[model samples]
Target: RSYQFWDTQPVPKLGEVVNTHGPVEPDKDNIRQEPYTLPQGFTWDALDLGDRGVLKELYTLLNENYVEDDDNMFRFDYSPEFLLWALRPPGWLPQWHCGVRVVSSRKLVGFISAIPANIHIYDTEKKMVEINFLCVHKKLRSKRVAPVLIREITRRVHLEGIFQAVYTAGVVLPKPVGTCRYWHRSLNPRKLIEVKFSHLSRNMTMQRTMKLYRLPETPKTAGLRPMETKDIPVVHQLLTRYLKQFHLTPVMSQEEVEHWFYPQENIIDTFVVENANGEVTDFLSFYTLPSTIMNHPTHKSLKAAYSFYNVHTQTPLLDLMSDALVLAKMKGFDVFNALDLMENKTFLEKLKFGIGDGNLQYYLYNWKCPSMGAEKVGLVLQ
Candidate 1:
């Protein structure tokens, strides 16, 4: 397979064997100082998410053109609040939030962004970029703006003294370090069936489906409570120690931990279990991401809960996840989604999670290593 743009970059080609693990190429002093040039009518712009209107502009651009189901029925409706939270993590830069707009009308059409992160690859812990939210207007897809956006974001990231990046996509590319499948647990079966996200089986009735996915009203685990600011240190230590089991994972600092896992209403929710001895043992978290139902008259949005960093100690993963489902249902979420990564495989089947139609491929830019199993891949990209 030939990749016109990827072939010109530093990534390793498909099926290439690797003996060493690190950057494929080191930085050079001759790095271009100017931004990548666009077509005559288009210009580059650094988005300022601080402004209310600018944030809304990005929201609208993605809501309309970013991604949707093959049937064109559902679109990933990332809220403005989620966007700001994701892009403005610790040590974020405005230049990394690159955008393209028509010179005449200044309408934002093309966009890509990267946030700094420290990735633990095999045995090495190194700084790298997490590239995400790459999108171009549907009308401009043929203009080759997507490749340019990739190159521009790569250039900016390289200038920051970082030569490597990690990203995930729904399609197979030049190569993937690992591939993970998606599993969805229904919290609102009726709504999910109504929205066509899932359908009833040939022999199964709606009532049976409801009974199959039913959960208790409250979590069964003892000492489980909403994580507060005071629990950050313990939760951070537990998460960091637990994540080390994976070959590829994020190495979060205390600040990064707080910024990412701190509970915020309607944005992120975390729970911790403190035993009778007052020792924080296990924790779980999920972020809210709602998708809009296209052209639907009554159902305008689908409230979804994406599983985040979850660490279980004395309590079983099955019990912890059951509580998560209960909490998500309590909050009126339509569904709970998780990838079959890390220790997720242990509970996905037992807890009634259905395999999703999509698979996510993880890739590393300017880096090479032997392919890894999905269970060995612990890092999760938003």
Candidate 2:
């Protein structure tokens, strides 16, 4: 279980049990100021994503090299607009969008990123960075670029007086604070089967599979509509109250709520249910992240909807989630996905969502806390 590089970091070791919560490495007065040195013919570059050319390079790097799953059939395809929204959250530091380029050619080959966030762990709230989109070109795996990227980001985060980070990965590393599984509900069953994303089960015909996941054309709840700017205040209050039930949650401000929840075409979609007298009672949201189909010639993209923060009141979770599926279908998503956290389990089986293959392990950098069950995790990192 010894990771060549992670064993030297501050995370909990394999099989080690932690009974307390705090930073593993105390604040230091002499944090390094310079970036980690790269290998020969490579240099560090802070990506200026505002430039169209720079953004496309990043998109292409991730698209071609970020391989996954048992069949290598699908890979994440993060659009330029999606990266701008995700990497440039409020109070975002440009230095944290770290990248590596070949010195002679200036071609991008490796990348890692972190965005500021406030996470609530039980009774305590602390500012931390959410590390995501760690990738290296398949042509450079032998160059040991990933560890250097991790160390460089750690140094930058440390300089900002933040000593903690949160990250999720499909593979098991040194340790995991919590583990969650993925689930899928097909919106376009025929496309899923044709693409081999879903298979026709025993004694089940294509028509039956299609009907099994069919949803209402429109939402059944009254006053259901897209979330607008004015709805932010009430939604914030509702989310704050609802997320308090979990052991781990995000400490979001009204601005953060607006930036994340306000809908953007093809990037995000959210719907809220208002009651009589115009009070926001329940809401559901899902962000769009599509994957490229490498094997299928006719279909080039697989549109997916990943469930974001959802709060419900005055309506059943089943009904609220059903409407989410309907809206996703209306938007032409190929499938809808959710993790087995929060109250999702209550409706996963009843709503006919099939279990996904891998576990998404949530980890904290330089922090130690007692392990939590999937139900205790309320924070979702995209």
Candidate 3:
């Protein structure tokens, strides 16, 4: 654990006997810690679900400083529905909830988190955990509390035999050592403009907002079928070519894609579109994990799904996306999030899918000198 985290705690977690295999030999090397110096007696720990009050205060504070509306006057507070959906346990454990409460002040000033378990991205062979939803209250901003949370998570994850975690952020900061590029396709243009999600430099005369809002024509293809186990090899080939277009992508093979999309053998449902020529034009697959939503279906608390449309943009790219949106809504999702790199400003501008804060960059003891593939930083956390 980084000193910022270990030093702040009151010695130990009572019977918290770190095993002999635990990394105890201090390496002054890559450790990043908070520097502003948390006031004496403040503490950081994994939060329990019962601390609703603390969360409410922290949420209120976060909403105040986080995604504020256009004029910076309105607060886009997380809806109770979202909080219940995003924070509930089993799917998302509060134990990974790295929060620091100032003792003398008794306020949850800073917070960051890591979501546990593994994501079978593309197949069971590549199980990976994702770390995201990292934040610190504005008052504690430059102090580097975010690094403490990251280091703690790193320590915890390393012990679990995991080598890396995935996340996305928008601007640059210092924490996420890895980066992933984002891709977006606009679904709602006028709303995006109204919400200030447009690029000023683009000669957007061709990007008529009216064009996007118009409902796309229903797909003319009839050969589209639910994805099958037999199609895994084809899907894997498509994913490999598609992901290489980006700077950061999860590496996987055919067997992994089947398990990654479907999670366990019979759990998730995968879909695809095929042409009369027997070419797979479009593909989409998702799996269930733990979530915070109340009626969450999986034994895990997760009630959400992410993108697996890592296939070609055939002549039917638009149709495929439009249909995917329909399927997502039918699945009863509260939010359908999308990621994008800043270069893909066009996608963010046209799609109804709002491009959220995905690839913000932050570093931790990283020299930034050998930065070759540093395209976009981690964005998603939860």
- With candidate 1 superimposed using the best TM-score fit, by how many Å does residue 368's alpha carbon deviate from the native? 0.6
Give the lowest summed-lDDT range of ten residues in model 1.
22-31
Residue 309 lDDT, candidate 2, scale 0-100: 83
Question: lDDT scores for all predictions?
Answer: 0.91, 0.90, 0.48
The C-alpha RMSD in Å for every predicted model, in order, reads 1.0, 1.0, 11.1
Clashes found in each candidate (C-alpha, N, C closer than 3 A): 0, 0, 51
Model 1 CA deviation exceeding 4 Å by range: none
Question: Candidate 2 lDDT, tens digit per residue, 1-382?
Answer: 4688999999988788998888888877889977888888899999988889999999999888875677898888888898888998888998998999999999999999999999998777989999999999988997678899999999999999999899999989878989999999999989998888889989999989888888888889888899998999988998999999998888999999998899999888878988887988999999999999987779988999999988998878899998999899999999999999988999999989999998999898888888899988999978
Candidate 3 per-residue lDDT over residues 143-177, each given as its tens digit: 66666666676665545555544554555433334
Native-vs-model 1 lDDT? 0.91
Per-candidate TM equals 0.98, 0.98, 0.51
Task: Sort every candidate by lDDT, greatest first.
Answer: 1, 2, 3
Q: lDDT per residue, candidate 1, 316-342, as tens digits?
A: 988999999999999999999999999
